[PDB]
Amino acid sequence: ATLKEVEMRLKSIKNIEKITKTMKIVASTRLSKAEKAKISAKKMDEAEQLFYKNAETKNLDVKELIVAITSDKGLCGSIHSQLAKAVRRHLNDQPNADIVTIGDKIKMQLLRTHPNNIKLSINGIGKDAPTFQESALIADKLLSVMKAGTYPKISIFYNDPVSSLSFEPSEKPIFNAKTIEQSPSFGKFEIDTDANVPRDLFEYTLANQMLTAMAQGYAAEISARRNAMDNASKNAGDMINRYSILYNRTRQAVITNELVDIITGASS
Template sequence: MLSRTALFVPTCTQVRGMATLKEIRNRLKSVKNVQKITQSMKMVSAAKYARAERELKPSRPYGTGANVFYEKVDIEQDKEKPKHLVVTMGSDRGLCGAMNSNINKLLKNYVKDHADKEIKFITLGDKARQALYKTHSDYFMLTFANFGRQPATFADAADVAESIINSGYEFDVGEIHFNEFKSVVAYKLRPLPLHSLQSVSEADSLAVYDSLDAEVIRSYQEYQLASVLYACMKETNCCEHSARMTAMDSATKNAGEMIDKLTLTFNRTRQAVITRELIEIISGAAAL
């Protein structure tokens, strides 16, 4: 009798490869918490994006207007010259799509394509420094961080421009790379030429303007650089918030889909556990 009863002792061993109810419940709870966080970040980014977009339109003439003089003078850069300066605009924080990774990829490719040149980086946004400083530390000249926490002002751009001019690096070829805002879901990495004081002074068409002396050219150079940087900062700020808002919206939707799948798995597993326990109880009662 005892030996016969022992054959029907109910077991509670877990099937290999099958998650327990507790594991599924914990996973479901963590995904719901993540969804709340991404939802909150999306709302914050949406509010910041609305403000950044309002401030973007009046700031764009600063960049286009400041370059009119150089377009009239028709300054050409000789990229075969040895000294190159690359200024990039990124962000201090992540979770904003491919905005920062595109800049990091551009800097890496620039080093490969101009391996025989002396290259220096000036980065606005700490993400580029974090990603490349270990492998490209010799190329970094200046790094500016924490400028994107608050909406950029012309004073911020003037401080950056003054630091670049007072750095003492006499470059032959200069470029500014920033993300140009297109729409809520689209932005494009765009280059702008960065001219040194020497290249402007040596321009052939400059002789048309008789009243220009070295001091006037230097003053306009400082103002032009600050204006272009200001416009680029506004473009970058708007791209960052729109990209983060889009990324957090996608993350919230993905979390919702994962919650639905986990809920279905949890209900099926619970039903399977209940059914198995009923079978074990009935089998045990029948054995008695």
């Protein structure tokens, strides 16, 4: 009712509207950057997975390790929420998996639902474009503190950026040292039986294909934040127009009322 109260409400709205209309543009600053690391990522997929394609590498059926990828940074539509969907959907067909969460928003999305499963959690992530150094160390800690190379199955979960306008939560396998050996067409290759190529290639792949997911999930998020802030700063703009009418009315009735009050004070 009060010009003060309306003055504050108009300011915090327009302020919100700067915040979001800039995050909308800080996204587009980062939009080109997102396609560099996105195609480069899908490019090594074609390069590094073609081996496994050709070896006919598949899961030994002989206890899963599930790795979910998002970020610590929110305000990106439903990047976090609908990856959590697809991970739960998957957790029905095998409830007993261990969960490693990379990013703080998928951590707490999943901590709400299956808090017993999460057994390691990676922080300080969404801030830059993803890197092999990050990947490799998270990988190293996966081998060390998680005993990754003892798992019957290992799964990576990320959002695959289908378009610039939409995204799709997908899932990909990582095959361990044993699983690489017992692939049907593994023999087709003259791998030198000397070094454990299966051990090192697994370790290299685990790091390598986490980074591919990270680079992709990263890209889709940037587009989700571009689109979410596109909507937010348009709503906020719409609020501003409305409130600018309400401010202007209260502006006037406050001048009128003071004047009537004064003019009355000399009715005598």
